[PDB]
C-alpha cells in the first residue's frame, strides 16, 4: 500500500534531451531520430520580445548558427524549419536512443510527467496536471525551456508538453510538440493572463478512492446523492461540474472498492461543506486534484 | 519558480533492474557488473515466513533454482551467496549498462528517489524520506520487493535502499545494498513495530525557505530565537531537535533569502503553536518535512 506523487520512469526521455544554442541563447531540445525539436524563441533576443519577427529571424539564421550538443558532444545541423511555435532542426545523426513515441495533445485535467532539464542535462522528474485554465503548476527556472512532459502508454512515450514560459502568477505555459500553445497564450512578451483556475472534481474523487484503498476511510459514511445535487454544491467551491463521463471513468475505482461513485460524491460534498476537521487524508490536509483515475489505478495496481 | 516533489532522473537505475525467480516466487533484482542483488526472502515459502532458516534454504538450492531475466533474455546464474539480508547471484554476463555507482547507508531525515518495479519492469519513480524511526512512507504493492532507492551525485548513482516489507501501520522497511536493515527490523514475519515517528525539523525549515523563495511570506515574523529555546518547543511537538550542523546546512537558503535561520525558527515556533489559521504554504495546509535543504537548493537553483 501507500500513495505517492509518482512520475513515469524518465529513462526513455533522458536519452532524447539535448541543448540547442543560437548566439548567446541556450535552451533544451528533444532529439528524436534525426530531428531536434525546441522552442522557437531560441532565435530571439530581448530586442525581439514584444513583436518577434520569427520568419525574419530564422531566415537570417543558417544551419551553422545552431549549436546542438548531446551530452557535451556536438551534432551538425543540416536543415531547419518552423512549425507553429516549435523549431525543427534536422541533424546529421539519428538518435540511437529514440524510443517508440507519439505526439499527443492532452486534455485539461489530465496529468503527465515532466523531465526538468537545464543545458541539456536532466535535473529531476515530477508529476503535473494540465489545469482547467491551460496552465501547469510546474517547477522551472531560467534555462528550463524545451523541457518536455510525457506519459508512457504501453512501451510508447506520448510526448504532450514543451515548456516555453512562466506567467507572473508563478504558473507555467507551453505547447504540444507540434508547436501549438495550450490555452490562450502566444510566444511574445505581451502581458498574458490565465483565466480563473478551478478544481478538477473527477481527480479529487479519484484521490478519495485512493485513500479508501489505502485504509483512510474516516470520511466515508453510507451517504449518497444525485449528480445534480452534487454539482450545485461543487460550483459553490469552484469545482468543475461533474459529468456522467467523469462518473463512468471512476468506474474501475468504484469496482475495486465497492463504493458507488455518487456515494463518494456525497462524501466529497460533506468535506467541502464541513471541512476536514483537522484531519488528514493520505498525508494531506487539503483535497488533492492532480491524480487522475488512471493515475490511481496505475499505482494502486502496479502497471508497468 | 514553483516547487514540486521532484525525483532524480531514473534512467541509470532502470538499466539495472531485472526479474529474479526462485521456484514460483518472483521479485526484482539489481544487476551491477556480473552480480544481481535482491532480497533473500525470494528463496522462501509460506512455512518459512515465521523463522526462515535462510542459510539452510540457500545452501540447499542450486544455481539452476534461480531464474534471472533482463527483459526477455536469461542471465545464467553461476554462483549464489548471501550478505546479511540480500542474496547475491553471480551471473555469466556483466550488465553493459552498469553505471558509476556506490553503495551508501543514509541517515534518518535524508531523502532519496525510489524506482518502483514489478517483475523487473519499472513502474514509476517518486521521492521518499528515511523517517527518524527508520521506516519510509513509500508506495509498494506485492511484487515490488527488490525495488531500490537512490540518489545521483552528478554521474554516480548512490544506491541506498532495497525494499523488503510493509509494516501493518502502512509504512515500509528495507535494507541498504549491503543487506543490513534500516532500524531494528528483521526479515521474519513476526510482530514488528517502529518506534514513535517524529517530524524532521531541518526539512520543515528548508521547505519554509522554499516557500519564501516562491513568494509566500505571510508566516514570517520579526522575532529571532536561540537554538536552545527553539529546541524546547520542538520537543513539545515531537519535532527532532535542531543541531548547529542543521543550522549551517540551511545556510545556502538563508543566503538566498536574507532571512537568518534563527529568525525562521521563530516563525516555525509560532506556526507550531497556533497553526496556519486557514492559510496555505506552497499549496499545502500542513508543514512538509520530506524536502531536505539540498533538495530545495537543487530546485531553487537548478542543479543537474
Ligand atoms: C525558458 C527560456 C530559456 O530556457 O532560454 C533562455 C536562455 C524560460 C522559462 C522560465 C524562466 C523563469 N520560469 C520559467 O518557467 N522562459 C522565459 O524566460 C520566457 C521567454 C519568453 C517565452 C514566450 C513569450 C515571451 C518570452 N519568458 C518568461 O517566462 C518571462 C516573461 C514572460 C511573462 C508572461 C508571458 F505571458 C510571456 C513571457 N516570465 C516572467 O518573467 C515572470 C516571472 O517569473 C519568471 C522568473 C524568474
Ligand atoms: C515484496 C515481496 C515480493 O515482491 O515477493 C514476490 C512474490 C513485498 C512488499 C509488500 C507487499 C505488501 N506491501 C509491501 O510493501 N514484501 C512482503 O510481502 C513481505 C515478505 C516478507 C519480508 C520480510 C519478512 C517476512 C515476510 N511480507 C510483508 O510485507 C507482510 C508481512 C509482514 C508484516 C510486518 C513485518 F515486520 C514483516 C512482514 N506485510 C503485511 O502483510 C502488512 C501489509 O499488508 C498489505 C498487503 C498485502
Amino acid at each position: 500500500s501507500g500513495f505517492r506523487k509518482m512520475a513515469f520512469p524518465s529513462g526513455k526521455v533522458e536519452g532524447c534531451m539535448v541543448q540547442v544554442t543560437c548566439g548567446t541563447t541556450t535552451l533544451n531540445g528533444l532529439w528524436l531520430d534525426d530531428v531536434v525539436y525546441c522552442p522557437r524563441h531560441v532565435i530571439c533576443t530581448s530586442e525581439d520580445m514584444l513583436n518577434p519577427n520569427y520568419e525574419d529571424l530564422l531566415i537570417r539564421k543558417s544551419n551553422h548558427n545552431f549549436l546542438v550538443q548531446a551530452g557535451n558532444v556536438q551534432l551538425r545541423v543540416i536543415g531547419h524549419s518552423m512549425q507553429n511555435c516549435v523549431l525543427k532542426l534536422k541533424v546529421d545523426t539519428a538518435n540511437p536512443k529514440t524510443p517508440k513515441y507519439k505526439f499527443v495533445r492532452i486534455q485539461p485535467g489530465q496529468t503527465f510527467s515532466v523531465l526538468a532539464c537545464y543545458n541539456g542535462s536532466p535535473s529531476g522528474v515530477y508529476q503535473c496536471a494540465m489545469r482547467p485554465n491551460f496552465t501547469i503548476k510546474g517547477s522551472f527556472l531560467n534555462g528550463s525551456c524545451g523541457s518536455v512532459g510525457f506519459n508512457i502508454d504501453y512501451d510508447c512515450v506520448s510526448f504532450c508538453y514543451m515548456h516555453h514560459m512562466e506567467l507572473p502568477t508563478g504558473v507555467h505555459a507551453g505547447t504540444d510538440l507540434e508547436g501549438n500553445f495550450y490555452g490562450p497564450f502566444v510566444d511574445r512578451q505581451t502581458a498574458q493572463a490565465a483565466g480563473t483556475d478551478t478544481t478538477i472534481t473527477v481527480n479529487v474523487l479519484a484521490w478519495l478512492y485512493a485513500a479508501v484503498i489505502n485504509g483512510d476511510r474516516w470520511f466515508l459514511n453510507r451517504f449518497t446523492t444525485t449528480l445534480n445535487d452534487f454539482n450545485l454544491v461543487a460550483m459553490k467551491y469552484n469545482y468543475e461540474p461533474l459529468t456522467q463521463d467523469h462518473v463512468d471513468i471512476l468506474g474501475p475505482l468504484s469496482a475495486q472498492t465497492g463504493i458507488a461513485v455518487l456515494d463518494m460524491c456525497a462524501s466529497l460534498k460533506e468535506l467541502l461543506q464541513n471541512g476536514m476537521n483537522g484531519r488528514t487524508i493520505l498525508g494531506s490536509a487539503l483535497l488533492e486534484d492532480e491524480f487522475t483515475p488512471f493515475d490511481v489505478v496505475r499505482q494502486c495496481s502496479g502497471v508497468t
Side-chain angles (χ1 to χ4, degrees), chain A residues 1-4 6-45 48-59 61-71 73-91 93-96 98-99 101 103-152 156-216 218-221 223-234 237-268 270-302 304:
Chain A
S1 75
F3 202 73
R4 263 313 299 111
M6 182 164 96
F8 291 96
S10 55
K12 295 199 187 333
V13 176
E14 288 170 51
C16 294
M17 309 289 323
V18 301
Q19 63 179 313
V20 177
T21 301
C22 188
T24 279
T25 297
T26 290
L27 46 74
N28 305 283
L30 187 70
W31 182 24
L32 303 179
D33 299 324
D34 65 346
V35 178
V36 171
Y37 306 78
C38 70
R40 78 176 164 169
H41 66 64
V42 73
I43 67 177
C44 287
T45 75
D48 314 292
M49 224 69 263
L50 182 52
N51 281 257
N53 281 53
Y54 284 109
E55 278 104 341
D56 292 330
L57 298 176
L58 189 62
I59 204 154
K61 310 262 137 192
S62 84
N63 294 332
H64 302 122
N65 287 109
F66 293 104
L67 194 32
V68 182
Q69 300 176 71
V73 63
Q74 190 188 329
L75 319 176
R76 214 178 74 251
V77 176
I78 59 172
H80 57 266
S81 63
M82 193 179 49
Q83 177 175 16
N84 304 301
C85 299
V86 172
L87 278 203
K88 281 150 82 213
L89 309 176
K90 197 174 136 142
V91 283
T93 318
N95 183 8
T98 302
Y101 77 85
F103 290 168
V104 304
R105 190 170 179 92
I106 56 162
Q107 293 304 317
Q110 306 190 293
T111 56
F112 51 95
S113 297
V114 168
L115 187 63
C117 296
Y118 296 90
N119 300 117
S121 176
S123 179
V125 66
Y126 55 82
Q127 197 69 358
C128 276
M130 184 50 73
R131 308 295 317 167
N133 68 1
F134 292 98
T135 64
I136 72 175
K137 281 142 145 202
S139 179
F140 294 108
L141 302 166
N142 298 321
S144 71
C145 284
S147 292
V148 297
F150 62 95
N151 282 264
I152 316 290
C156 177
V157 179
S158 298
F159 294 105
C160 59
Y161 179 80
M162 188 173 267
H163 183 52
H164 286 250
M165 69 208 200
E166 190 175 298
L167 297 180
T169 58
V171 302
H172 305 101
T175 67
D176 52 43
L177 269 294
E178 279 188 334
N180 289 310
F181 266 88
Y182 289 95
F185 308 109
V186 292
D187 58 346
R188 309 190 296 159
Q189 199 166 318
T190 184
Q192 306 170 50
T196 290
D197 205 8
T198 52
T199 301
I200 306 158
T201 313
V202 64
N203 291 359
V204 176
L205 292 166
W207 169 83
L208 294 167
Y209 276 105
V212 170
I213 294 170
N214 282 273
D216 284 359
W218 64 263
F219 58 81
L220 279 181
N221 299 278
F223 297 174
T224 199
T225 185
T226 71
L227 199 52
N228 180 251
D229 291 323
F230 172 81
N231 278 331
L232 280 171
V233 172
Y237 297 97
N238 286 308
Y239 266 57
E240 71 180 14
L242 194 73
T243 68
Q244 184 78 29
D245 297 321
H246 293 157
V247 176
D248 299 331
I249 60 171
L250 291 161
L253 303 174
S254 176
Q256 168 193 5
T257 58
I259 308 299
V261 177
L262 302 186
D263 284 34
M264 189 77 60
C265 286
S267 292
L268 176 53
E270 268 284 283
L271 292 168
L272 297 173
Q273 287 182 335
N274 286 16
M276 280 174 68
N277 295 322
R279 303 280 317 249
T280 57
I281 298 176
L282 289 176
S284 183
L286 284 192
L287 297 173
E288 299 284 323
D289 65 355
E290 292 202 355
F291 297 103
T292 66
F294 182 62
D295 290 347
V296 174
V297 171
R298 155 165 93 260
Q299 85 169 284
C300 297
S301 313
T304 68

